[PDB]
Design an enzyme around this catalytic site. Structure first.
Site, PDB file in Angstrom:
ATOM      1  N   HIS A  69       8.318   4.084 -11.779  1.00 11.03           N
ATOM      2  CA  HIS A  69       6.981   4.566 -11.375  1.00 11.03           C
ATOM      3  C   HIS A  69       7.081   5.724 -10.401  1.00 11.03           C
ATOM      4  CE1 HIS A  69       6.449   1.501  -7.795  1.00 11.03           C
ATOM      5  NE2 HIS A  69       6.808   2.672  -7.310  1.00 11.03           N
ATOM      6  N   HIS A  71       5.247   6.418  -7.514  1.00  9.53           N
ATOM      7  CA  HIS A  71       4.999   6.189  -6.071  1.00  9.53           C
ATOM      8  C   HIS A  71       6.233   6.569  -5.293  1.00  9.53           C
ATOM      9  CE1 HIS A  71       1.636   2.879  -5.731  1.00  9.53           C
ATOM     10  NE2 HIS A  71       1.142   4.097  -5.885  1.00  9.53           N
ATOM     11  N   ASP A  73       8.091   5.148  -3.160  1.00 10.82           N
ATOM     12  CA  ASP A  73       9.209   4.187  -3.051  1.00 10.82           C
ATOM     13  C   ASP A  73      10.248   4.279  -4.171  1.00 10.82           C
ATOM     14  OD1 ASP A  73       6.951   2.933  -4.603  1.00 10.82           O
ATOM     15  OD2 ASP A  73       8.413   1.302  -4.886  1.00 10.82           O
ATOM     16  N   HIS A 132       0.635  -2.789 -11.425  1.00 14.13           N
ATOM     17  CA  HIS A 132       0.800  -2.458 -10.038  1.00 14.13           C
ATOM     18  C   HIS A 132       0.458  -0.991  -9.778  1.00 14.13           C
ATOM     19  CE1 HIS A 132       2.642  -2.159  -6.104  1.00 14.13           C
ATOM     20  NE2 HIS A 132       3.326  -1.137  -6.569  1.00 14.13           N
ATOM     21  N   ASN A 163      -0.087  -4.935  -1.926  1.00 17.08           N
ATOM     22  CA  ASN A 163      -1.001  -3.812  -1.892  1.00 17.08           C
ATOM     23  C   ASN A 163      -1.497  -3.392  -3.260  1.00 17.08           C
ATOM     24  OD1 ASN A 163      -2.092  -1.633   0.174  1.00 17.08           O
ATOM     25  ND2 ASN A 163      -1.591  -0.561  -1.732  1.00 17.08           N
TER      26      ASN A 163
END
Length: 210
Positions: A69, A71, A73, A132, A163
């Site tokens: 993904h 994001h 992180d 997510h 989250n």
């Protein structure tokens, strides 16, 4: 075998889980043509250390990474990958999102279902739908029936959804079902964060979504 610094834990002869500090996971695939990571790390600093640890241990180069993904992180080491000539595979959506958010762009070469071979190691990437994040994919090793869930999949120790700001909490259950339908015999599931489990982690994630 578990080897620390970043920690790597052996699942089998050619497959290891990497974990960096909360803690997040990915895979190291020891292949006959080089090392392949399923996800790199949080940032450039940890990504460089991860790479250096594995290259020294396995005596081969990291050639490829699969980004699950966009994001921060998961995308955060992308600078390091690109400047070292490490191929950063992703879906087109993940690449779009990365660019939008100011990161360097992975390849955008993964489709809904992509089958890769690295030496003798077979890897399938699958986009099961939103969860997510909008773009989350899973990674399957059909020779081992090992599933890398990423942040789509919660560990047993996760007692809430965490989250959900970029999440799609309706579609997430359908997504998880699509993974259960595609992969009916799973030996291990690697969640995004936490301990390695089995198909039970998919069922756990479904429950957290109720």
């Amino acid at each position: 075998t578990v080897i620390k610094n970043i920690s790597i834990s052996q699942l089998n002869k050619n497959v290891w889980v990497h974990t960096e500090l909360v803690p997040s996971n990915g895979l190291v695939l020891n292949t006959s043509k080089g090392l392949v990571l399923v996800d790199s790390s949080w940032d450039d600093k940890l990504t460089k250390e991860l790479i250096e640890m594995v290259e020294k241990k396995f005596q081969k180069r990291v050639t490829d990474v699969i980004i699950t993904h966009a994001h921060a992180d998961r995308i955060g080491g992308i600078k390091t990958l690109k400047e070292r000539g490490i191929k950063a595979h992703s879906t087109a959506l993940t690449a779009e999102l990365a660019k939008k958010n100011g990161y360097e762009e992975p390849l955008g070469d993964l489709q809904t279902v992509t089958n890769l071979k690295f030496g003798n190691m077979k890897v399938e990437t699958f986009y099961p739908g939103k969860g997510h994040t909008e773009d989350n994919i899973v990674v399957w090793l059909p020779q081992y029936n090992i599933l890398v869930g990423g942040c789509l999949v919660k560990s047993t120790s996760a007692k809430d959804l965490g989250n959900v700001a970029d999440a799609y909490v309706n579609e997430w259950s359908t997504s998880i079902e699509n993974v259960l339908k595609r992969y009916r015999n799973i030996n291990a599931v690697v969640p995004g964060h936490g301990e390695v489990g089995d198909k039970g982690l998919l069922l756990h994630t479904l429950d957290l979504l109720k």
